[PDB]
Design a protein around this ligand. Structure first.
Ligand code: NA
Length: 130
């Protein structure tokens, strides 16, 4: 599924993302926009290290979900990577929450540093009623 902006923002608020481990909803929105374009079925193979990024938050198979074909990988969210390609984003959000519980937080995603950090991210939630 490809979410519309405000539809996602309302969804993430209901799922308790606003202010999770210190991260405002507008930041999660900026992350999803730059990682996947709000697309749950997005995948990106990384040829360099044989890992894959899965779903709306482009969560990596080396550390967070199991896809069986990543060498030396762990499965910190305790999920098949498949779970992160559903239209329903409950499991993806729970895994995102797990990612940010590590010391790096939201900095775990290089896209967030490039595109979101120190920016005016208000635009991603404006007019959405959240
Ligand atoms: Na894994």
């Amino acid at each position: 599924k490809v979410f519309e902006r405000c539809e996602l923002a309302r969804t993430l608020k209901r799922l308790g993302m606003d202010g999770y481990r210190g991260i405002s909803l507008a930041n999660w929105m900026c992350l999803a926009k730059w990682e996947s374009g709000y697309n749950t079925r997005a995948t990106n193979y990384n040829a360099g290290d044989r890992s894959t990024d899965y779903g709306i938050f482009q969560i990596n198979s080396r550390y967070w979900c199991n896809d069986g074909k990543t060498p030396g990988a762990v499965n910190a969210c305790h999920l098949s990577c498949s779970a992160l390609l559903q239209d329903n984003i409950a499991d993806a959000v729970a895994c995102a929450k797990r990612v940010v519980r590590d010391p790096q937080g939201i900095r775990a995603w290089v896209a967030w540093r490039n595109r979101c950090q120190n920016r005016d991210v208000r635009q991603y939630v404006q007019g959405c009623g959240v």
